[model samples]
Structure formats: structure tokens, C-alpha cells
Target: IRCFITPDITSKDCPNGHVCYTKTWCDAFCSIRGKRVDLGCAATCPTVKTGVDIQCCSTDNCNPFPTRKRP
Candidate 1:
């Protein structure tokens, strides 16, 4: 959902003025986070927010609209 720009060109190995080239890899990482519902993964991606190192997901029963509720 968000784009991550890696400033660590030393490791990312992106060309000068082309940090955006890593967008594909970064986007893939975020996509996997969504599919796995791994909030930590999402948060780990680079972002404007500081201290955000992982994504977060809400926990709920697989079936929320059951005919009978568990007491």
C-alpha cells in the first residue's frame, strides 16, 4: 500500500538518482505482508513514521457472522 525508498544505496545497490528502482522489490515485500496478514512485515518497510518496524493486523474469528455465538 505504501512505497519504501531505501537510502542505503550501499546495500540496496541502487543507482544514483534511481533509488526508486528498488520500488519493485520493496513493493513485493509489502504485498507479502498483506497476504500473510503480517503487520510486522508491513511496518518493517521504510516509511515516514519512525520506530515502525513491522505491520499489524487485527485478530478475529474466521467466521464473524455465525448463526450461533459462542458463549
Candidate 2:
């Protein structure tokens, strides 16, 4: 599976005249049963002054892993 992160109103690369903001940062992920994979940041925003933390995870009946589970 392929995942992509893109701007809200612009392309994945954050084209000219378009700025990347905290709200603009988006995340996409793909996974299979009992397996979760992080595709990483797909879009590069030049306008973003701060880092926008983005994350992706898998959720399905086969994969019953709870997010933020205390170990």
C-alpha cells in the first residue's frame, strides 16, 4: 500500500504561492492485519516555520491494537 501527505489546498510538494501550516499538514498510512506501518511525511512545506507532528496507524477488526496503550 502507498500513503501520501499533502497540503490542504496545494500539491504534495507544496507549490509556489502556497504555504504549509500546522493545519495543512496531513498524514496517510496503510497496514495489514496485526501489522501497522508508518509511511512517513510525504509533503514538504516550505512555509511552515514549526514542525507539524503527523502520525498514521492501522485500525481494523483483525488488528485489534489499541492506540496509546499503556505498557
Candidate 3:
């Protein structure tokens, strides 16, 4: 139970986060072009198109941040 990785999105070097052993859970995939925003992590919850914003949690280092926005 551990998540919280980052590829970009103001995470500013996420300290290389990750620590899960099975049945991944804690995906925070967000991608919104225009200003720049594309994080990482994902073990499930897949299916995005048209902008982008995803967030799944399960505890221990759960990834969060993608409240869904477009303006």
C-alpha cells in the first residue's frame, strides 16, 4: 500500500515515490495541455481522452491532485 509518483504537475521532483507490492492502487494520471500538466502512476483505472484527469486511491501514499478542470 503505497503510491505518490510524479512526472510533472508542480510535483517538483516527487522524491521518486512508489511502494506497492500487488494489485496496484493509487493512480493519479492527469494531462491537460495548454499550460503543462502531466503526472504519472497507474495500476488500474485506465481510459482517458479529451483533456485528462484521473485519481484513484487505496491508502498509504495514495496519489491525489486532479480535481478536473478546464478553463
Candidate 4:
């Protein structure tokens, strides 16, 4: 499965979850930052050095903030 995340606000590209690293960029969450994808374990995404609400996710197209639902 692929995903969506933009680090440059106008850019387009998120590191491929699959092992096949391609050359491109995603311009969705560009103005946003702070997302982590470690394996197995779960951890609250550390606040970025800038201290925003951005966090990392692994599910498909989860980078874009629709709403943060905690349950």
C-alpha cells in the first residue's frame, strides 16, 4: 500500500513503506512535520523541535490531518 505526505507544503513525496525507494515527493503535508514509523512497538510521536501537533502514521494516506481520533 502507498501513502500521502508532503514535507515542503508544495512538495510531493513520502518515504516508501515498501522496500522499493523511488525518486519523487508528495506535496500535501509540506508545511507539516513530525512523523515516525518504527516497527512493532507504539510510541506517541515525539513533538518536533518546533513543537506542533504533527505526528507520524503508517496507515495509507494517514499523514494528512483529517482529525485526530483517540480511542
**What would you estimate as the lDDT of candidate 4?**
0.31
Per-candidate clashes, comma-separated: 9, 0, 0, 13
Candidate 4 residue-wise lDDT at 50: 42
lDDT score for residue 42 of model 1 = 29
Q: In candidate 1, which residue pairs get closer than 3 Å at backbone N, Cα or C atoms, i.e. clash?
A: 39-55, 39-56, 40-54, 40-55, 43-53, 43-54, 43-55, 44-53, 44-54
Residues 1-71, model 2: lDDT tens digits:
12223212222331332222222222343122222222222234323325333333222111122243110
Residue 44, candidate 4: Cα error in Å is 12
Residue 27 error, candidate 3, Å: 23
**Whole-model lDDT, model 3:** 0.39
Candidate 2 RMSD to the real structure: 13.2
Worst 10 residues of 2 by lDDT: 57-66
Residue-level lDDT tens digits of model 1 in 1-71: 22222332122221222212111112345444421111111222335334222322222212121121111
Residues 1-71, model 3: lDDT tens digits: 34534543332223334331112222243243232333344445556555444445445654534333222
User: Tens-digit lDDT track for model 4 on 1-71?
Assistant: 23343232232334434221112222355337323222211134433334233344545444432322111
Candidate 2: residue 59 Cα off by (Å): 28
Query: TM-score for every candidate vs. truth?
Result: 0.12, 0.16, 0.21, 0.28
Which predicted model would earn the best lDDT? 3
